[PDB]
Amino acid sequence: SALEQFVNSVRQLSAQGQMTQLCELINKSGELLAKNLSHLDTVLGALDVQEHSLGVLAVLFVKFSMPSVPDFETLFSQVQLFISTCNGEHIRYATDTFAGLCHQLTNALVERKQPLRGIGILKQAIDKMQMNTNQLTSIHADLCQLCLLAKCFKPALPYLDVDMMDICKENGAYDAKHFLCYYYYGGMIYTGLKNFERALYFYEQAITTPAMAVSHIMLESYKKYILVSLILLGKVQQLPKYTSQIVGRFIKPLSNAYHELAQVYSTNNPSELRNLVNKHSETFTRDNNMGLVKQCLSSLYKKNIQRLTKTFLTLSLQDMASRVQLSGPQEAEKYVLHMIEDGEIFASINQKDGMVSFHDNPEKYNNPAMLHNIDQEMLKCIELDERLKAMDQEITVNPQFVQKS
Amino acid sequence: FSFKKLLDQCENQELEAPGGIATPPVYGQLLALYLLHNDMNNARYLWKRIPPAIKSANSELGGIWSVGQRIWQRDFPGIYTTINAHQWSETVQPIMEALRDATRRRAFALVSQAYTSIIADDFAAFVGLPVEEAVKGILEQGWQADSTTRMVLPRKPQQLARLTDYVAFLEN
């Protein structure tokens, strides 16, 4: 009789319909929960994980808040079951603790050897935390990091293909570190997938974050921003005007090997570029971005070949190899053939005369497929306009607004 | 059409595991499926994802990565060479046969588009067929071949509802 009474004290908060006092009880019962040590039967026997999601969240967070946990196999299993069977609606009342619990699980999995088991856990955690898929939470950074350390880049793609709109404050627990990590790890995920169009976009967002103190994440994102812009484009893309002045006064001096690499890239001379790579080999390998710099060397050859199309209709393989410094007609034939396969160039190879002919006829903009492409872009602009109009309608109905206007 | 579900089911099996490590047989299926669709970026990261203990114990994973390594460097003769060099298990045999045939269409499209005249010796290596066979194959598709030079010359042979949506958006 008395045992069931202790459970019944939870029922009064649910019956009243006011969830505000339930949240306050969780934050004001930390000391009582910390000195229990008997949460084994509290998670399941004492409370139900289905509807008492707030109660089970607090005890699991307390268990993960104790360094040197005696057992991890049961702790991980309980977290997996709780997140899989979360109610979702009431979880958003304790956003600061739900995100903190995911952070604790991510650090534990990353620490030893296994940043792969939690990929599916954080996928459902985001879905039951964000108001809509077009929103950014702190678990997005953790999911990208798990997908990064395990080299499983595909599960994170659905969470990186959506442009984030509004950021979850998670009761003030969201800081700039979570914002920088999402747009830095996510940019590196796209780099490994050879998606340099969106990788450059992600790095740019991290740099443009307002700041007054030097951040390591913003420093590395600046270094990789130069390399990606040197691969996708022929030059370093100019940063937006609203970039913080610290980036151009502290971060830029600390990234000097990458700036001179861009200058040599502008001379369109591969042999000089390889000399600077060897000279600054220790710097690039220390920053762990070895391979991105080597991709700049290969992209310089492609850039030089693409310049030949702006001047020639037919060029001999030997003559082309002397202008792009490929040292051999056989090497030029392979380089050109790969570009045609990838679609980077419009050319054909004639082995009868040993000549390469550039056919600059991309599209006549007459086929019905061009109409389909136009309406796909038009729909994107329409959806963009709908969101823009809706968000200013939220401003008009704001009580804080029209008072100052 | 059946290749769509097979790739997805192997990816999901790797995501959730009883102990975080997947079975050796499903690792080869995922690697072969990545090569079939020419998705080399995920195949390369899958190789590093395989634990060293599993890779050393099972020699099949080493062999399947050899075929993928040839595709990564676009070494067309090596794609057919390594595929037939080793014998694969029965669960990945049919998809690897489809990989070899898929490489054949890739070579045919590459030559038909990137070449106006290719010598017969190099053309045979691309398709993976013997030199005499490649001579007979082209005329069946209409491609011209010339004697005394051994050179092949390939050549490639609701609007109303949408429109009113545009106006309604512009007129509000």
Curated annotation (Swiss-Prot), chain A:
One record GO biological process: ubiquitin-dependent protein catabolic process
Summary of the tissues where the protein is detected: Widely expressed. Expressed at high level in heart and skeletal muscle.
Domain PCI: 195-363
Phosphoprotein keyword on record: yes
Manganese listed as a keyword: no
Chain positions with Phosphoserine modification: 405
Family: Belongs to the CSN3 family.
More details: Amplified and overexpressed in some osteosarcomas (OS), suggesting that it may participate in TP53 degradation in OS.
Function: Component of the COP9 signalosome complex (CSN), a complex involved in various cellular and developmental processes. The CSN complex is an essential regulator of the ubiquitin (Ubl) conjugation pathway by mediating the deneddylation of the cullin subunits of SCF-type E3 ligase complexes, leading to decrease the Ubl ligase activity of SCF-type complexes such as SCF, CSA or DDB2. The complex is also involved in phosphorylation of p53/TP53, c-jun/JUN, IkappaBalpha/NFKBIA, ITPK1 and IRF8/ICSBP, possibly via its association with CK2 and PKD kinases.
Subunit structure: Component of the CSN complex, composed of COPS1/GPS1, COPS2, COPS3, COPS4, COPS5, COPS6, COPS7 (COPS7A or COPS7B), COPS8 and COPS9 isoform 1. In the complex, it probably interacts directly with COPS1, COPS4, COPS8 and COPS9 isoform 1. Interacts with CK2 and PKD. Interacts with the translation initiation factor EIF3S6 and IKBKG. Interacts with ERCC6.
Protein name per UniProt: COP9 signalosome complex subunit 3
UniProtKB/Swiss-Prot annotation, chain B:
Gene Ontology CC: COP9 signalosome; cytoplasm; cytosol; extracellular exosome; nucleoplasm; nucleus; perinuclear region of cytoplasm
Gene3D superfamilies membership: 1.25.40.990
Domain PCI: 1-157
The keyword Cytoplasm belongs to this UniProt entry's keyword annotation: yes
Superkingdom assignment: Eukaryota
Coiled-coil region(s): none
Principal location: cytoplasm
Keywords of this entry: Cytoplasm, Nucleus, Phosphoprotein, Signalosome
Subcellular location: Cytoplasm; Nucleus
Annotated PROSITE patterns: PCI
Pfam families xref list: CSN8_PSD8_EIF3K
Swiss-Prot/TrEMBL GO biological process terms: activation of NF-kappaB-inducing kinase activity; COP9 signalosome assembly; negative regulation of cell population proliferation; protein deneddylation; protein neddylation; protein phosphorylation; regulation of protein neddylation
Family: Belongs to the CSN8 family.
Subunit structure: Component of the CSN complex, composed of COPS1/GPS1, COPS2, COPS3, COPS4, COPS5, COPS6, COPS7 (COPS7A or COPS7B), COPS8 and COPS9 isoform 1. In the complex, it probably interacts directly with COPS3, COPS4 and COPS7 (COPS7A or COPS7B).
Protein's job: Component of the COP9 signalosome complex (CSN), a complex involved in various cellular and developmental processes. The CSN complex is an essential regulator of the ubiquitin (Ubl) conjugation pathway by mediating the deneddylation of the cullin subunits of SCF-type E3 ligase complexes, leading to decrease the Ubl ligase activity of SCF-type complexes such as SCF, CSA or DDB2. The complex is also involved in phosphorylation of p53/TP53, c-jun/JUN, IkappaBalpha/NFKBIA, ITPK1 and IRF8/ICSBP, possibly via its association with CK2 and PKD kinases.
The protein's name: COP9 signalosome complex subunit 8
